[PDB]
Design a binder for this molecule. Structure first.
Ligand code: G2P
Ligand code: G2P
Ligand code: GTP
Ligand code: GTP
Ligand code: MG
Ligand code: MG
Ligand code: MG
Ligand code: MG
Lengths: 427, 430, 427, 430
């Protein structure tokens, strides 16, 4: 009954993935050994969405861990919760991809990918009715980006009628940790445009801003950043995992949020978010959550929503709440902020409510916005790509892996077209 | 797996290598007898029980320098067959190194290398240590590099070279050797880190408060740089850089593979107590000309790419801040065809310090490897030096005697001219 | 239901503000943690006028704390009651304004103010029906004066239909602590004339006189002075906070006290005021309170009311009192002192009564007088300004912040016009 | 944040600075080794654990004075790189300071300053200590000030200067140096506190009952004034004055930035017991000519602005009373274009006293900084002195030898004449 298959590719994908798994096990009352020690029957009712049931009262993540480097795998296995994963679901190379999309997509990744495909087929067979796939990775490196994209293509070919979701961490110029990021992002974005049904644009810069400005966190770590992403991930699939008053799964969300096939790039947000000191001076109420969610400072993509228009927003609420209140607050936001919503889609907001709140909170919210302002993110990347490509800088490496210049030209064109399309509907 | 094979050629190469192996031993807790009372496997093979052997070959055409190793403190660390010695040196003559004397020993060394490589299951590549100026360091290394390139092909070769100084030159014929080795270095090496003794001396006097720094002081410092490069393979941290990764980031065009290395902080025990050596500070210090390992002016050049390799108590956020600060500094200019020129590595292990060393123990260190057009200045001075001597054909007869042809010299000079021109070109904005 | 939004700008504003908050929390039975520990249901009935209700039986001041220096903020936070304030409501710079109105109004303050605006918008949104704003500050410095004025302008632009009230501490020549005071006051007064609906003219000199002469206080501190101001502030809004027999809020007071738009500069007074020794030899009665209030020595502005005429007086009484007695005493004062009241406004006195007296007293009174004698205060200031401006002394600093001489000329003209207008109605 | 960087130039500057740093240490509870068993951060950087380092640079062109610091009690307080020394002094020659000798050391000192400033996150500005008469104090400081003005621009620079006496002059060429430095001081300094040794000596003999006051006595007193100025940043009280604030209040016109400082009460342990040193009294004592730090007659000048900086057990009301009293005193006249000439600061911390010092411990103290036309008299006498010597071109050749031009002297004199004239003008009533 509606199983999701999880895939983690490259370092970032793996680490975020681990965080996701940790949170989800806690949510469903699963301990580091795979045993259920929860309180409520609701925690086990839909356990099969994310876990396969093994012999002797144990649950195992329907998760595939992929990397061209074994170090990441080792790190995962040695982590808290590392032992819950199926040993046969770790699919690793020995070499690494050296921040080269071509190595990940055409060479080393190509050699690797068949094993992964074999694993995922088995995982699909195991599930009674697989609704689809969730891939966590980055676009800026070689494995997550090149290998990940390749894997996606393969998956879609075999499961063309299933939902294909990605949580993609994009490279920003402020927090620019690598040189060839523009290339890798450009190449991967193109592929994503044709083969994913919904893509959550996660930005490290935005995460840092959230941590520093909102969470008041003097020294955020990648772990802290990852936590935010994990929360968001949990939010989307809450309706699949628990009961509720109004329920929307992955498909329902897509249908309401994607009016044209290409426009499936979301700016996610999560509410509430408070400092430890500033927690006592707040109201645990729906109007507050709503206020938080639509704010630009709470979006996980480095784009100002006020620089574009919202095509659609999907809001997913967790906790015991008044439907009327939710409906009023959502109508208020669209009436007051009329100018930030496209006028040819009346009621730009879709609402879903799950009765089970996350742990530690009485209420929570997850926001998925499809904004034309996401073009900013793509534009910057394009610019950076151009800056390098005009001089054919670092191209030789890519060509050594069998790539041609023409592919670069194509990808760039494609991305530009996508950008244009978004602009068109923005008006 | 992930092994790296070290080759130490001639006196300079041997002596740097000694320091390196002292440092590695200390880092992995391996005693001078090979016993260790895991990651060390990147540098060491392991035999039987309580024995670790360096993945290294030491070569010289004369016995004297290697003989010290055999007699000395680390005699039990290396097996005798990895320390290879001829009878007569190359006498500061490239020809003797590459042809007359080198042709007698090269096969043997290759065989040993092959044996060594067969024992490693995930070979990352080679670290080659040698001088540019000596007959062995130039002629022999050049020959060796060719053979390695032939046999192994697509394996990465990284060479750490003691390039001759502008002023402080110890031999007369240095410019000839330097020019000749450079020609071969171009085609057979994947990345070359040039280093200048004069610069190191200045650093030792200015930053370490040492009145009289000797070669032992230089070598120790040099080893640290190598350790920083290989720490990403020998340990693990938040952000990791493999050798291939490094190459991808740092090398924009095949010929332009000459990054300058700089290390920070280099401080005395007493001088360091007062200083508040933050991530931002050390990063800033990296991009200053006074702390460079080669004598030359970056202010007069442009950066194409910099790798920053941090180690110890460091977090990403502050590295990012440092990078941002560097971006806003007008005196540090990057070429327009590189919108972000920073590859960043962060490793958890603080730099370990050699007992009786000149450097103080710090919580954090950094090694910056930057490809700047400014290094071309060194080549210009060397070329100028070469051109004077060649104008008179001074010393040329010697080289000819050992089988070298005059046309080779001219060819070599031409190659270097072409390289300088290439470097000029990449510099200019559009 | 009729929320007031409080703003504190600069050192003086902050400190007086703190005092105000302390008194008000005591009045409404709120302790240093934000918890209600009062006795009467009347204390909580209208708690929402000044406090937002946070989670877990806590109340938080609808207060914004603003300064170009963080020291003041630190001092506030470290004070008794410092922890009651919302951490996110402290909006501080790092530099300071150096007693320069231009830095506060055009430069540093400009950079600062948007954060403040963001905060106050949120605070407005939170309140169900905001009646308006109360700003505490001084006119003689740089922050409170320049930044404060700027903030006022911004506020009024966004809330043109809301009541805009200031408690403005004016520089006096006797207690002249700074050199450029005349400039700062002149510039700010002008701005106040156009954008505030009512302005309480608080004078340090008068406060000192009260403390020394009436309270018999050998060594008054700024705290003691501040207390008086706080009392006055509390008095004005008593009708919004409690029940009563005849009730007048901020609007009702303004409408009765301001016959022409510009003439909204009040001389406040508070009664009773007694020494500790002289407390036993007095009558707790309405005639006594009345007697005290209309006396020149009990006005908080350094102006002799006998040097002008009263346009209007508003008297606000707290405690259980006879309406008849109040009416008789107010008629008596106007009949006996006929010559000090303008003859073309019959019944120059407006009365309001709140049944709840302040703590420690059975009855109290707050006096708001609109006297043409306030011109004295402006005239002195003008003179001092002239003395400096004639020689262009210290002008260079202001011009370094982008100011022109012409602005000075304008401000001076404006103030003079205001003075003339007051004289006109005095006759 | 709110840091202030101190620069101590030449012998005088160094020696004053020593006293200052002794005082600061005592005030913040920092031991002579940098350890402290918060606000101190305005003067000190903090490193690692149990170490605080002064935000200061000490410069002299000769090694002798600084060498004392290196050997002495506070050797561990400063890191060696903050104590900068050349080999040969400027020999009471402005030219040598500004050009011949100074050009060799200025860059280095600037670099260090920049490094220091990079460590501070809220730089308020610079405190520059130097003599007017010495070749280094004049020539070097002038040069340094120019460079600082260029590099930093709108940062506030405050200079504390040992201006030469009318009678008690120790060198012959003092008037030349004084005139030359003044020219540059005008354009590059934001506020300048002149001080006169003769006046200090008189104070020590008359007020402190010291038969024989030496430089150590002067310096200690001088440091106190600096402490009063910076106490508003290093502590907090009822009424506060920042540096920018101070400048705004005290400086009516850009060129007229020469306030006279005076400190009260300056008393002996035994003499103080009998005196009832009230706020009113000390305030009154401030405006008396006998307690001035410069020899000159305020009774013959007019006040334009006075800052009164109180510290210790003081409340506003009594300060106000004192100010009122001062207003009613006919012998203290203020210009007509300043209807209120009082900026007032009040800080809670009483003045701390140096063990073995000449001053008694008091509950309250005050530092008055007042801009009076009377200081112009000093300039007049100095100008007169200059004019005699220049009439004969006495000593001029020396300056010329070191690259100075005669025209510069004339230019400088003209500038000072213009300044005196400006001062005269502001004085007169309308
Ligand atoms: N938000 C997070 N970002 C991360 C994390 N780890 C890495 N990154 C970011 O992602 C980029 C580096 O990507 P990766 O390590 O994932 C490259 P990958 O291992 O997939 O392929 P290779 O090219 O083979 O290394 C860069 O922007 C990092 O700063 C993480 O845990 N969280
Ligand atoms: N009645 C009171 N008057 C005060 C108080 N604090 C200061 N003042 C008076 O106000 C004037 C000084 O004003 P401020 O400290 O508020 C100047 P502000 O901090 O707003 O701006 P800056 O110029 O940036 O310092 C002066 O007349 C003081 O004597 C107080 O607590 N009560
Ligand atoms: N940094 C450093 N440089 C060295 C050291 N030993 C020699 N050199 C430099 O190396 C160059 C001389 O070359 P060598 O390596 O001694 O000569 P070789 O390779 O043994 O060649 P031949 O003796 O001529 O066969 C000079 O530039 C020396 O300054 C050392 O320990 N450290
Ligand atoms: N108040 C005070 N004045 C001093 C001190 N030391 C020197 N002076 C005065 O400073 C002037 C002499 O200048 P110095 O500072 O010794 O000379 P310098 O700056 O080192 O210049 P050169 O030695 O010529 O390079 C004379 O007016 C001295 O009286 C001191 O410790 N305190
Ligand atoms: Mg990786
Ligand atoms: Mg040799
Ligand atoms: Mg202030
Ligand atoms: Mg000297």
């Amino acid at each position: 009954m509606r199983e999701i298959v999880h895939i983690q590719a490259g370092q970032c994908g793996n680490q975020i993935g681990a965080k996701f798994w940790e949170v989800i096990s806690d949510e469903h009352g699963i301990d580091p050994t795979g045993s259920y020690h929860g309180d409520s029957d609701l925690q086990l009712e839909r356990i099969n969405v994310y876990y396969n049931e093994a012999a002797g009262n144990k649950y195992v993540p329907r998760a595939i861990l992929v990397d061209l480097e074994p170090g990441t795998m080792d790190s995962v296995r040695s982590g808290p919760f590392g032992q819950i994963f199926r040993p046969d679901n770790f699919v690793f190379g020995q070499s690494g991809a050296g921040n080269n999309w071509a190595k990940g997509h055409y060479t080393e990744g190509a050699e690797l990918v068949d094993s992964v495909l074999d694993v995922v087929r088995k995982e699909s067979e195991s599930c009674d009715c697989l609704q689809g796939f969730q891939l966590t990775h980055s676009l800026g490196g070689g494995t997550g980006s090149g290998m990940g994209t390749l894997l996606i293509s393969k998956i879609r070919e075999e499961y063309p009628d299933r939902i294909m979701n990605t949580f993609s961490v994009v490279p920003s110029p402020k927090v620019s940790d690598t040189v060839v990021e523009p290339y890798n992002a450009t190449l991967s974005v193109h592929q994503l445009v044709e083969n994913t049904d919904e893509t959550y644009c996660i930005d490290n810069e935005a995460l840092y801003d959230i941590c520093f400005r909102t969470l008041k966190l003097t020294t955020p770590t990648y772990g802290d950043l990852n936590h935010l992403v994990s929360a968001t991930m949990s939010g989307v699939t809450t309706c699949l995992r628990f009961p509720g008053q109004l329920n929307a799964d992955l498909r329902k969300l897509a249908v309401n949020m994607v009016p044209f096939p290409r426009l499936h790039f979301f700016m996610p947000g999560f509410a509430p978010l408070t400092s430890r000191g500033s927690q006592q001076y707040r109201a645990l109420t729906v109007p507050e959550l709503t206020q938080q969610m639509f704010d630009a400072k709470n979006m996980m993509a480095a784009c100002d929503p006020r620089h574009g228009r919202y095509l659609t927003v999907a809001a997913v609420f967790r906790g015991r709440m008044s439907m009327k209140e939710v409906d009023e607050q959502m109508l208020n936001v669209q009436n007051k902020n009329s100018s930030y919503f496209v006028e040819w889609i009346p009621n730009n907001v879709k609402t879903a409510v799950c009765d089970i709140p996350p742990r530690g909170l009485k209420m929570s919210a997850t926001f998925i916005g499809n904004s034309t302002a996401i073009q900013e993110l793509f534009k910057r990347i394009s610019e950076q790509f151009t800056a390098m490509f005009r001089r054919k800088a670092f191209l030789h490496w890519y060509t050594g892996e069998g790539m041609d210049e023409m592919e670069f030209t194509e990808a760039e064109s494609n991305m530009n077209d996508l950008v244009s399309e978004y602009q068109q509907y923005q008006d | 797996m992930r092994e790296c094979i070290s080759i130490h050629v001639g006196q300079a190469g041997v002596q740097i290598g000694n320091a390196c192996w002292e440092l590695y031993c200390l880092e992995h807790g391996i005693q001078p007898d090979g016993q260790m009372p895991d990651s060390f496997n990147t540098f060491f093979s392991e035999t039987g029980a309580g024995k670790h052997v360096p993945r290294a070959v030491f070569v010289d055409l004369e016995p004297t320098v290697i003989d010290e190793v055999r007699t000395g403190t680390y005699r039990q660390l290396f097996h005798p067959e990895q320390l290879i010695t001829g009878k007569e040196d190359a006498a500061n003559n490239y020809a003797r190194g590459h042809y007359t004397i080198g042709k007698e020993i090269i096969d043997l060394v290759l065989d040993r290398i092959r044996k060594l490589a067969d024992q490693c299951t995930g070979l990352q590549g080679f670290l080659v240590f040698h001088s540019f100026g000596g007959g062995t360091g130039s002629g022999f290394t050049s020959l060796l590099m060719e053979r390695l390139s032939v046999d192994y092909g697509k394996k990465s070769k990284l060479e750490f070279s003691i390039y001759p100084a502008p002023q402080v030159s110890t031999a007369v014929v240095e410019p000839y050797n330097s020019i000749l080795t450079t020609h071969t270095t171009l085609e057979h090496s994947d990345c070359a880190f040039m280093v200048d003794n004069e610069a190191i001396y200045d650093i030792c006097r200015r930053n370490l408060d040492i009145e009289r720094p000797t070669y032992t002081n230089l070598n120790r410092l040099i080893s640290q740089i190598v350790s920083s490069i290989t720490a990403s393979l020998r340990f693990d941290g938040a952000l990791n850089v493999d050798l291939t990764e490094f190459q991808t980031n740092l090398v924009p065009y095949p010929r332009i593979h000459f990054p300058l290395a700089t290390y920070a902080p280099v401080i005395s025990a007493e001088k360091a107590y007062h200083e508040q050596l933050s991530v931002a500070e050390i990063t800033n210090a990296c991009f200053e000309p006074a702390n460079q390992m080669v004598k030359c002016d970056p202010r007069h050049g442009k950066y194409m790419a910099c790798c920053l390799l941090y180690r110890g108590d460091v977090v990403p956020k502050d590295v990012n801040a440092a990078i941002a600060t560097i971006k806003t500094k007008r005196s540090i200019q990057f070429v327009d065809w590189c919108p972000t020129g920073f590859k960043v590595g962060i490793n958890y292990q603080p730099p370990t310090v050699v007992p009786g060393g000149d450097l103080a123990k710090v919580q954090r260190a950094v090694c910056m490897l930057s490809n700047t057009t400014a290094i071309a200045e060194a080549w210009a001075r060397l070329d100028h030096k070469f051109d004077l001597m060649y104008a008179k054909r001074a010393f040329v007869h010697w080289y000819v005697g050992e089988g070298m042809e005059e046309g080779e010299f001219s060819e070599a000079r031409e190659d270097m001219a072409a390289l300088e021109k290439d470097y000029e070109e990449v510099g200019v904005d559009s």
